[PDB]
Amino acid sequence: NLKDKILGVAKELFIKNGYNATTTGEIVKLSESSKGNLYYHFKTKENLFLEILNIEQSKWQEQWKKEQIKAKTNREKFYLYNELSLTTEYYYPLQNAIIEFYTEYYKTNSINEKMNKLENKYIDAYHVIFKEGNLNGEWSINDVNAVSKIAANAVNGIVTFTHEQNINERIKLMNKFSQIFLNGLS
Amino acid sequence: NLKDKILGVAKELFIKNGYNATTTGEIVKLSESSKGNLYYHFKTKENLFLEILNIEQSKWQEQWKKEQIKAKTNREKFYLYNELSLTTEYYYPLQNAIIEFYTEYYKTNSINEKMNKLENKYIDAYHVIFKEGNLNGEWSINDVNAVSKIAANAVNGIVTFTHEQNINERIKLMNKFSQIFLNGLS
Numbered sequence: 001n002l003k004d005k006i007l008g009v010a011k012e013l014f015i016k017n018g019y020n021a022t023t024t025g026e027i028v029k030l031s032e033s034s035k036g037n038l039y040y041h042f043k044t045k046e047n048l049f050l051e052i053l054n055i056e057q058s059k060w061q062e063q064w065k066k067e068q069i070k071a072k073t074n075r076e077k078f079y080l081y082n083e084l085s086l087t088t089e090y091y092y093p094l095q096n097a098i099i100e101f102y103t104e105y106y107k108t109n110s111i112n113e114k115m116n117k118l119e120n121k122y123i124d125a126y127h128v129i130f131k132e133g134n135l136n137g138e139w140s141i142n143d144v145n146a147v148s149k150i151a152a153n154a155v156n157g158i159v160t161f162t163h164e165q166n167i168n169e170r171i172k173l174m175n176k177f178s179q180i181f182l183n184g185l186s
Numbered sequence: 187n188l189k190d191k192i193l194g195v196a197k198e199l200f201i202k203n204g205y206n207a208t209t210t211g212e213i214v215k216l217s218e219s220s221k222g223n224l225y226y227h228f229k230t231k232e233n234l235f236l237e238i239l240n241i242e243q244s245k246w247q248e249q250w251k252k253e254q255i256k257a258k259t260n261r262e263k264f265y266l267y268n269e270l271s272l273t274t275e276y277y278y279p280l281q282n283a284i285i286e287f288y289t290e291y292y293k294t295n296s297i298n299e300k301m302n303k304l305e306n307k308y309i310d311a312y313h314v315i316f317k318e319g320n321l322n323g324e325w326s327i328n329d330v331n332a333v334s335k336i337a338a339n340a341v342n343g344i345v346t347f348t349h350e351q352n353i354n355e356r357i358k359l360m361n362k363f364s365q366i367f368l369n370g371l372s
């Protein structure tokens with residue numbers, strides 16, 4: 001809880017002032033904790049931040065569990081999952097803190113460890129989509145892991161770089177992509 | 187030089203550190219110049235940046251033409267472009283900086299119009315490839331602009347978010363993508 005209170009406050013601080021601007025000092029004081037306790041729990045602001053990210057990852061996964069029920073078939077889950085990825089990121093408060101962070105630890109190969117266990121978790125969502133797709137003859141992929149890393153990165157690119165259009169066009173392009181992609185698997 | 191030495195240091199810092207990460211102070215101090223050195227041509231920092239992007243875009247689009255000749259069919263031109271995208275030293279090594287600049291200059295509509303031509307030179311390569319593929323009957327695509335953007339963005343994704351894993355693994359994926367994509371247009 002004192003740990004949970006720190007992550008909560010830290011998350012808000014980041015959302016409000018971004019990664020670089022937030023200090024562990026602010027965090028310590030606002031969560032009514034101590035430099036010692038924050039050290040014992042996270043060691044560094046970077047670690048603190050990766051922990052928020054993990055928690056955030058969990059929530060996303062959980063939501064997806066409830067949300068994927070609106071998609072009977074896996075072809076549908078693929079369509080749905082990509083759209084959510086697009087819309088939900090449009091209004092995600094942490095997005096900017098993430099970007100600061102990511103484009104700040106691109107050089108540090110130390111963070112590359114947890115940073116990757118995290119990304120892998122996101123790819124599993126797709127991995128599951130495709131596997132189940134196989135066991136239902138929705139398509140036939142023999143290199144799932146591969147197709148999974150590809151979708152995850154192709155879709156995130158559309159989400160991250162399309163930024164330059166009206167939300168409708170984007171959902172449109174994204175659905176066109178999902179269409180093409182799922183097609184080239186038959 | 188100087189007007190071309192600034193650009194040199196700037197590009198270097200933008201790539202290495204990041205957009206916000208580097209400021210008009212560092213650029214000058216590291217280029218053996220003065221603050222006044224910027225006014226007529228390089229007014230604002232965002233102008234100096236939008237500059238470097240134009241250069242790099244041209245340098246990459248040029249390298250591409252001096253190399254697409256190794257591809258007879260457009261089907262091959264598609265695959266190639268994507269692979270080269272992973273190996274170049276032009277434009278793509280700045281995506282991270284670009285992503286920030288778009289999260290700190292998306293409001294000021296002074297940019298959304300300023301570097302609007304930049305978004306076209308980026309999707310142009312695929313425009314030609316996809317259009318010329320129609321004439322050559324390699325495929326039948328009606329919504330070219332869509333596909334060009336979908337592809338341009340998906341690809342930038344595979345390139346930007348795999349920057350840490352084995353270059354061969356990268357090129358392998360990029361190829362399975364190109365494979366999957368084009369096959370979905372038929």
Ligand SMILES: CN(C)c1ccc(C(=C2C=CC(=[N+](C)C)C=C2)c2ccccc2)cc1
Pocket residue numbers: 060085088089092098099102118119120122123149152153156160347
């Ligand atoms: C709020 N939200 C749903 C999300 C928020 C972020 C991501 C991301 C990402 C991109 C490629 C990945 N792969 C395929 C390794 C993993 C994560 C990501 C986006 C920008 C900068 C760094 C990572 C995905 C979903």
